Design a protein around this ligand. Structure first.
Ligand SMILES: CC(=O)N1c2ccc(-c3cc[nH]n3)cc2[C@H](Nc2ccc(C#N)cc2)C[C@@H]1C
Length: 115
């Protein structure tokens, strides 16, 4: 059920999203900007391993469309995006190091949620 604080919490989420997409973090955020194009990357098993793809452009579309009803729903998609990366790729891959850095940005700012 909607809480009177959900709009303000969603503004905090939108601020986080803008930060994740900003030039400040682009050196490690870029793999997460768009859906994984498995065929283009030669990763022909990606959709057999990853049931629910997620990426920041999809999060942005969902925010713009008012799909997220609360902060926890937004956070679940951001964390799904990172989890997919940790599931599919070897833990020493460059993309995993990038994911860990971007997830640190996310988690520390998400923790500052007004509540
Ligand atoms: C997010 C994610 O898990 N993945 C993902 C997604 C998009 C893109 C992409 C976008 C444009 N081009 N490539 C590349 C990758 C990863 N591959 C690499 C990532 C970083 C580096 C360096 N430094 C080298 C390879 C493979 C992996 C399936």
């Amino acid at each position: 059920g909607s809480h009177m604080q959900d709009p303000e919490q969603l503004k905090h989420c939108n601020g986080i999203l803008k930060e994740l997409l900003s030039k400040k973090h682009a050196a490690y955020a870029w793999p997460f900007y768009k859906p994984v194009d498995a065929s283009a990357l030669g990763l022909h098993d990606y959709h057999d391993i990853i049931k629910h793809p997620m990426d920041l452009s999809t999060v942005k579309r969902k925010m713009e469309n008012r799909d997220y009803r609360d902060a926890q729903e937004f956070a679940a998609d951001v964390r799904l995006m990172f989890s997919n990366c940790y599931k599919y790729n070897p833990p020493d891959h460059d993309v995993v190091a990038m994911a860990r850095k971007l997830q640190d940005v996310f988690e520390f700012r998400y923790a500052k949620m007004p509540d």
